[PDB]
């Protein structure tokens, strides 16, 4: 029932390597079957039941069986599990490529859209034609067969690449040893939880929660650069390899498809469409930045100067690539009066939370009740039910999986593992989502605390949660977050602007120790420091978008070259000689690959969305916030992009509020 | 797979 919760929730994470085996082969025996059932069917004999209805009801059982066998590779802590989960996704992603790539099925889906009355259908229904045509072209089922057959084994090579990519990144464990003096002004609570070593050294790892505080506050500078050089090295002889095979092969069935580069390619999948409006869009904004990155690059000179002669230090007179994040963090301490670790006394886990859930009950109209003695992959992972507020319908439940362990995913990810969409018998599925992100542990008897950017960064994941539970489709391929690539940040970044509102950070905080909140005068400087580092800030995203695009428009060049070249080119800081940043870069095998520039691209959109509508309205206005669920959320990938967009702006998108909230206007 | 920034 859409207005129950037992039962609809058929995922079960207690799978022993075997059992992942042995489903994975079943799934891909009884999916065949149907495809295998569709072929065989003479092509005038073709129906919107026989046909179309068949695949769309066979979609939404592959994907929901499918995420049971890949998603434990991410957070299941028995190695064993997550390599047969990473086996099985090896399968699917062959099985996959397989299915996609019949002949027999494309022209049956052509015949369809070509006699069916296309006026009498759902629109939905003939997105999914028009969409399914589309994509059998992307794979050259129009071309000759020797060319399907040659696009066919590339893309098996190139699925086993990026698998291979970020295993290597995942299951990476180097560590770097440093006594207590190296690691000056860390504070005690990050130098206790280090392990320690026989010589009463401690433990660094290059894990996102031991990297960034060691480069935002280790004051000694060998330390710095020694981290630097280990983390942006990770994986540089085997992925480098990788990288050397991917990127021509992307090339090369862009160019068997008709596609001048691979870039262009994935471009026409987007909703910026051409590559040449992704340059323009790149190289303009990095005109209006540049004198704001100059300003901030003098200012963190001087501050390294001045550091150096007050220490005795030498001073090489240049800022190093470990020099950046400690001398930014310098700038929010002097300029704003930010201290991150004072602050994050004022954001225990349990009262971020709540505040977070709150905010969004509010906003969006709906209802979250945590589950109890859920079944969980992990017994830190709690379970929670959404329901409509004003109906009681239940939308989707979703898992919050917060802390670091062994073997999880060590950034911060929402996944989708059940769409919200139509089943066989006419029913809605239950949306299913997972929150997983490596949020600091609770130390030194204290609660997790969190800085502002893990909050931030939870309710950044908490909108993509949103999007997957709120969104409601026919199809299983439209559901949930399966909007344009560089349309599936605007949810999520939009979300961020409310961690930069006096009143809301208000509701997110608590002191950890006395209950007392956070000063008035305290929050007003958190909430005017938004802009600090900026310059810098967005120039470096502009770097790695520029590096995506060129490692996927001119196959031949050195990638490790090419991100130095854009490195002093546009962000002014040079990349440090012998490492390798793009062999580290995951999204170029994670499905951001010629896309990087998305999230950029996505924040035009949200800062549009908040200036034009939330701010001026209120941004805890229920009904803003509820054509915002209605208009953005809702129809999931069932309209384009912009379509939603207009939908809600009454109006095409523009970067005037972008401008505006970058200081650029 | 839908991830953030890498810083
Ligand atoms: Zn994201």
Known sequence: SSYTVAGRNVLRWDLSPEQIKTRTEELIVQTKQVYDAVGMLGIEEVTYENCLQALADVEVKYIVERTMLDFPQHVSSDKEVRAASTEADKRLSRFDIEMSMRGDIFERIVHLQETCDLGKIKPEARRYLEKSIKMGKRNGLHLPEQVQNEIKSMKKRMSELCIDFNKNLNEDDTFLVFSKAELGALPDDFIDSLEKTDDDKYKITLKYPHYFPVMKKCCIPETRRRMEMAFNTRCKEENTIILQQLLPLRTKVAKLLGYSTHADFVLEMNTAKSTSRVTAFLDDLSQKLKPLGEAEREFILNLKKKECKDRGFEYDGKINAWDLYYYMTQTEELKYSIDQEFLKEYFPIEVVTEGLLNTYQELLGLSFEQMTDAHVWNKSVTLYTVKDKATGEVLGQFYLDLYPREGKYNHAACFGLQPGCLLPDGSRMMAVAALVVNFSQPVAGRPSLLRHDEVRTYFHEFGHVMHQICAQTDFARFSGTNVETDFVEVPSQMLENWVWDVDSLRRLSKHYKDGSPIADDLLEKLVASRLVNTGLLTLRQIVLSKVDQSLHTNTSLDAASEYAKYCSEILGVAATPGTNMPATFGHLAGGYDGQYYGYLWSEVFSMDMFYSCFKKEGIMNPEVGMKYRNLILKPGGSLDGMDMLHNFLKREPNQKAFLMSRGLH | ?7
Do not use: A, E, S, T
Not at chain 2, 1 to 7: A, D, F, S, T, V
């Open chain 2, 1 to 7: 797979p839908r991830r953030p920034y890498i810083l």
